Each structure stands twice: as structure tokens, then as C-alpha cells.
């Protein structure tokens, strides 16, 4: 059985142009998509489908596909965050996005997930999803019940570990001694493999220590500003009303966009840990300079919204 999904009343699906990619990124995307197609997760389509969402490829040997569903997400219907996560000595971020590929996507909604692998030449290759896609806000919401069953035996044996999922990421928090924390993360990886997950980047662990980090309305949106200082030094604030800050910080570095891009990722990760939401950024940089370079330094599996200022 599949979950029926609608766009928000009054909205059509996304029609976002694919941006130019290097020959190397295209090659990688073609191999990834060929295998997804073989595996039935996507299907080729033609120009009868008017929708489109951008795709590119990142490196964290192996490229990873990254579909920029920011517009589709804004257009999709609406469907818990642990307060203790930010309190844990260590939080390790795992990538598990391959998990969504086992659940079919409402046949009526598939057309809206269309994307285009550009070509060096010709228009390029168009596909749409048949299965819950990575990066789409409905996929965790539909899969939520199944991931609870998968995690439940592990949570039962480890009641003091906090596990929180945001999109493709699992955030796993413990107060254990660092060696023991890391060994428990491997135990969780192996638990997931025994339940069928085979995510190619699961082996990596991105390690946070939020207890060492520096009035919130869930309905409200989080906003982040960033200011360039100097010699690789940036400052930021997260708020909801410009005066009433919820967090402030500094990131320290090479070029600016690369540093700004790392700062944006770091700030978003903190927001996800603290509140479970990505903020909307006000970026101190020119649109065209940002757009030329940010994908060269992006390593996250999500993408926040941004504006330029």
C-alpha cells in the first residue's frame, strides 16, 4: 500500500531549471541513475512532463547524488524533536538515505519528482521517481513508522542513546566515553545492515560534541544571518524576530565561498540538532558568485533555503 500525497492547494509542481555541470559530475550521475533505473527506483520520461528539479553530485572515489528538492518541498502538503540531543557529549551523524528506496511513491505524485541529467552536448536525460526520494520532505514522514520498528530493538537495549532522523541523516547521541560511543555507532550500523539497509556512505561518521556549543515557536521559521569579519572569520546569529536571538557563534577557516559554505553547513547542523529545522539564511555574498561555487564545497545531504544580503 502507498500513501496518497497532494501538493498544497493553489500550487503547481516545480519547474526549476537544471544548472550546468562539469563533465565529471554528469558521468557520475549517469552511472548512479543507470543503476537506480535498473533497480526500478526511477524511470525515464519525455517532455510530456513539464516539471523539473535540479540535481547535482557531491563528494564527502565515490560521488553522491543530491537532488535539490527545496521547491518541491515548499509545494508539498504538510504531514518529534528530542530536547536532549543537544545535551549529549557526542552526536554522530550517519547517512542512511538509501533507506527510502524500498517504499513506492504514490503513482499520482511521481510526475512532480522529475529531474534532468544535463549533457555536455541535446537536452539531457529526464527521470522521475517511483519510490520515496532522498531529500523530499514526505519521505521521512511516510517512512517514519517503518524506521521506528527498525530502531526499536536497538533503542530498547540502549535506553540512554538518543536517535533523531532528519531527512537522510541519523543523529545518534550518547554520553558514553568516546571510544565506547564510537563502538556503539558501529553496533548501530551493523544493526541497520541486518535489517536490510545497505547505504554506501554509512561507514563514515561525522562527530559533533554539542555540549560544548555556545523562546522558540515551532510554527515560526528560523532565520540565520552571517557577517564576514576577517582572516577567515565569520559571525552568525539565529533568530525568529530580528532582536530576539536564539544562538550566536563564530566559524573560523581557501576562498570566501568555501568558508561561507562550511559555515552554512555548520550552522544548519546546529539548528537541526537544537530545534530540528533548517534555518533560512541571509548570505553576505553576491548571488552569482555563490551560485558559481557553492556546490564545489557542499558535503551535506540537505540544502537550506537562502537569500543574499
Author numbering: 6 to 65, 69 to 87, 95 to 136, 139 to 214, 224 to 240, 318 to 356, 362 to 417
Q: What does the paper behind this entry write?
A:
Formation of active HIV-1 reverse transcriptase (RT) proceeds via a structural maturation process that involves subdomain rearrangements and formation of an asymmetric p66/p66′ homodimer. The viral RNA codes for a p66 protein that forms an asymmetric homodimer in which the RNase H domain in one subunit becomes destabilized, leading to subsequent unfolding and proteolysis in order to form the active p66/p51 heterodimer. We utilized the isolated polymerase domain, p51, rather than p66, since the initial subdomain rearrangements are largely limited to this domain. Two different fingers/palm/connection (FPC) subdomain constructs containing the same interfaces that are present in the monomers and in the p51 subunit of the RT heterodimer were investigated using both NMR spectroscopy and X-ray crystallography.
